[PDB]
Design an enzyme around this catalytic site. Structure first.
Site, short mmCIF file in Angstrom:
data_model
loop_
_atom_site.label_atom_id
_atom_site.label_comp_id
_atom_site.label_asym_id
_atom_site.label_seq_id
_atom_site.Cartn_x
_atom_site.Cartn_y
_atom_site.Cartn_z
N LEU A 11 12.67 23.08 -16.14
CA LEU A 11 11.86 22.01 -16.72
C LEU A 11 10.76 21.57 -15.76
O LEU A 11 10.30 22.36 -14.93
CB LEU A 11 12.74 20.81 -17.09
N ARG A 12 10.36 20.31 -15.87
CA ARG A 12 9.33 19.74 -15.01
C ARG A 12 9.72 19.74 -13.54
O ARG A 12 8.88 20.03 -12.69
CB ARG A 12 8.99 18.32 -15.45
N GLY A 13 10.97 19.41 -13.23
CA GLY A 13 11.44 19.45 -11.86
C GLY A 13 11.56 20.86 -11.33
O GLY A 13 11.46 21.10 -10.12
N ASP A 14 11.78 21.82 -12.24
CA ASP A 14 11.87 23.22 -11.84
C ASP A 14 10.55 23.74 -11.30
O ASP A 14 10.55 24.68 -10.49
CB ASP A 14 12.33 24.08 -13.01
N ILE A 15 9.42 23.16 -11.72
CA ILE A 15 8.12 23.59 -11.21
C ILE A 15 8.04 23.36 -9.71
O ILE A 15 7.61 24.25 -8.96
CB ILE A 15 6.99 22.86 -11.95
#
Lengths: 315, 317, 290, 220, 230
Positions: free
Chosen positions: E188-192
């Protein structure tokens, strides 16, 4: 113009607690928790002449010894009387500005450097100095937040308050961060209490005469403390017993690392009134209850600690 | 001119309580509860007109005691002479919702705490009053000297004045922490005989009739009280208390749950006034126990019959 | 000049009470409520004219030859030092001497500021000792709040105007007011004879006031009636006694009879009545047996 | 300087010849000072012993309000301008058809561009208005009101719930004061209906419609 | 007035996690649990941890902030700083700090906690007691006590100082990014940030997928509420 040295006899353990905070300022403080006022202000003021006439410098609001560049805050550090102690209490109705000064305007805490800032019923004050005062002692200075102005004049005190169990004690935030915890019992000996009334009559019969009655006894008590100043050097325990001191907590060391380290220094003071130059065994047991009893979280207290102390040291 | 000091015609117990406090300056706290503040004001005037003359020296605002004690270290000690002076009693009652600065003063401007050297201080409807300056006033009972340190000031006005308390029960009791330092606190109850009060009402009309013949109405009766009170003043030091009887006093309060023996301490000294009034030198166990129990009722946190029942078989019954 | 005292129509109960206070300074005091006074000032201006001239304000700026001053009275203000004085500068409390002032706008007023008025009866001096013997007429406002648990309890003749419709009476009052305001000339003579008789009767009653008669043994019934009610600061007997004295020196009957109770029970009891009139009257009748 | 506009001017004209009537409490208004200046056009402190003043409570204003009846240091001034302050008033505009705006704009052009020589546009009415005011002034203290009619007037207060009724007394006098410019021997609904809600909207406890409905019931 | 950062021991991964975002300007506040007499000491140690605020805007640009379990703090900033987190401009690099017993922040704040950190309790304080003695040694002449460890502290300023100027030499592998979809995107967004974390992680020392695998579970709990073939 005060009560005698061993006045209001009975708080002998309390007298010891006051002595424990004395000499060594790293203890942290004490929290008086009893049934009522009981005129404990005299017991609080019982260390009035006990403090020697620490040397003075000029006449600044802050009580400062001469020289000592580490203790020279603003002017004495760049400038180049043995005054009595001035321990004071804390008014109930108060504000943060009252504990400071909008500069340079000083504050009550700054004017009371190196003293016993008395306090009672601390449960009444909510947040104003709950952590601000607690953390002030560790810093050792009074920082300012007046925009560009940020004077951090040194701040020294004793920081031992009081309170009543009726209004609660505290939501646990800095109670572990506070000094040793202690309480008071209920006086059931009417004969002992009768002598107190007689002692009060003795105090009322003639303050000066009564003073002359036990004046030599007052000098003897102060003698041990003055010599105990040199006792701070050495007294280096092998730490082999101190190794098990942490192991002694164990189940009781669930949280509060900071607390375990502090109690270790207490043994040196514990084996200092006795005069022993080496570490005195069983002194930790004599101070274990007065170490982290309040800090020990729960749902036999001392008795449980004593039962645990059996496995800790061996008896 | 004021109403007669013998116009009380009632509250004998309250009247007796106030007189004993007058005799011993270090008696403690005095207060009265009820629903008739005017009655407290009446007693106030009666108490004010119930003392001999007191000496001053020349002009001192706080107090000009003509070299009695050595507590004249302020200006008088420097002057230690315009001292042939002796004034009378003078009451004092701070207005409701007063000013703390006015109560304290500044520097040196004298604050409201500059009344009669002793007594005078009185407080009607003190049940509401205020939280600030109240404990300081309670502490001012044992202060013996003022504390002026504004902007680095240093002054200690050596004043030691008694206090009188009054407040309607509708305002509720004070804070328990502030409820302490109560040497004596009771109440006055009316009677269902207006007829009997009508006499006093008629006496009030006679009081309102004319100042003439008012003093002569009870001057011989009034003169008796002044002589009796002054007589006990000189013989006040000659107090005899029995330790074995005194031992029973704490044993009496064994089942009292005082939460602090501070009240029981001065409770022993209470019987001294009764003995001084009686004239007997030796302590009378029964009288001492009765006085102590009556005085401790206010401090008995949680009726008097239960205390009396407790007093039974304790003092011996 | 203003409208005549007798020219005022209505409020007979208020008129009876108001005259009593002037008749005897012993009178505790009246208090009046009722919003929209619509002439409240004139309702009190009536007592101003009804007063014999007396030597007052004799070369003394506090109120040699003595001038028989006719009358003088103020009503009310719109500072505390201005209210009392300055240090020796007299303040507003330096003219009510031997006079009376209203209590207009006391519903709001100012707590801890309007207290010297209560602490003014029988002052005899000041504290600078200026003698003070002024009278006071309470002027409250309905629906404007009444925060007086016992603060206004000092009130004695508590009453208020309660006119409802009075349509023909209101029309007649309006017409009379218009006629009087059109030309006071000969409007004074329209009722001049009546005022003199009232002034003479009042003076005679005041002169004969000291010879009043009563009976406390007879007043035992009044004492019992008061006991039947609930009181906390008393003064009820004193109010009853003063009202009885006024009633005795109100019709000229140099004696004591059971009519002052019926005349002044509402005027006295309602001031400190427990927190009504019909119940008080029933209780009084039951106690008296009438 | 503005033709017509008798919706609010009529109250001003009636109050112009009513020194007993008082209490202007307004709450258009763009003219403001100009409207006040317009009022000064239809007219010939210490110097105000015989004059009028305009208002742009407390201490000065509260004392000024009572100075009307207490106009003596004689004052005799005509005032122009909480429930307690509401009593000191007896009479209490509208800034939408473009035709009115067009006439106003043309009048605005006539006034601003032609400040001079434009007097004759309203001078004949304004000059004759002085005679009308003079005619009403002479017969002002001559007319009278009927008591039987006053019964109907007094009946208005029965349904009315506003206390004091001082304005009602003034309103009874207001109708008699009016109709003086009209010259009629007596006063009909012309004086009754029009002046009914004229002062009633100020000391009011359907602001006027309910009052008019009661007035219609009260009146014949 | 300074303390040796390396003197403290225990949970050394947190210091590396602190070191991970020490020079990172695109990281922001990172969740860090563990509140006790220790947490306060570590935070003070974090202040004195490396040379060249906490729980005023002009003197706040590009500054760290030590939270104090803001769940119990004022909601005025909580309703604002949560959105002000990664706002873009008026800057600052705060650090989420608190404890589960001290509060759980807000659900949106819980949904975006950045890096997740925690501190546990360990018995047998063999080194802690010596650290207590070292703290006592630190107490004994702190000006001289720091000097004993100063040469080690002195040899730390340039440890990662020059490792950030040219840190972005390479980029995350595209194949590795697709492999993240197996677990990270699947759970998700944190995975970026985690995708570029290895570039930031393996930069201080001398510039490997072992660090990425280790950092795979480093902040998983912050987003959870094998992928790299491990």
């Amino acid at each position: 113009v005060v009560f005698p040295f061993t006045a209001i006899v009975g708080q002998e353990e309390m007298k010891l607690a006051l002595l424990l905070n004395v000499i060594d300022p790293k203890i942290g403080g004490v929290m008086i928790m009893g049934d009522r006022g009981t005129g404990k202000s005299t017991t609080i003021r019982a260390l009035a002449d006990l403090l020697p006439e620490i040397p003075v410098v000029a006449n600044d609001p802050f009580n400062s010894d001469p020289s000592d560049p580490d203790l020279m805050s603003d002017e004495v550090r760049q400038k180049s009387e043995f005054k009595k102690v001035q321990m004071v209490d804390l008014p109930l109705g108060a504000t943060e500005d009252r504990v400071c000064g909008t500069i340079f305007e000083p504050g009550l805490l700054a004017k009371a450097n190196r003293g016993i800032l008395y306090v009672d019923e601390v449960n009444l004050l909510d947040d104003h100095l709950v952590d601000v005062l607690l953390d002030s002692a560790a810093s050792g200075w009074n920082t300012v937040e007046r925009e560009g102005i940020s004077i951090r004049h040194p701040a020294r005190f004793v920081l031992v308050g009081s309170g009543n169990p009726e209004e609660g004690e505290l939501r646990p935030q800095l109670l572990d961060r506070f000094g040793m915890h202690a309480e008071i019992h209920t006086v059931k000996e009417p004969a002992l209490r009768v002598q107190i009334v007689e002692q009060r009559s003795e105090f009322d019969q003639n303050p000066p005469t009564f003073l002359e009655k036990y004046n030599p006894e007052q000098t003897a008590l102060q003698k041990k403390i003055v010599e105990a100043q040199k006792l701070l050097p050495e007294v280096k325990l092998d730490y082999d017993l101190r190794v098990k001191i942490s192991e002694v907590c164990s189940e009781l060391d669930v949280d509060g690392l900071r607390g375990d380290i502090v109690t270790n220094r207490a043994a040196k003071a514990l084996t200092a009134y006795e005069g022993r130059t080496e570490v005195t065994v069983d002194d930790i047991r004599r101070v274990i209850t007065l170490c982290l009893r309040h800090r020990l979280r729960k749902d036999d207290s001392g008795y449980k600690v004593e039962k645990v102390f059996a496995r800790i040291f061996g008896v």
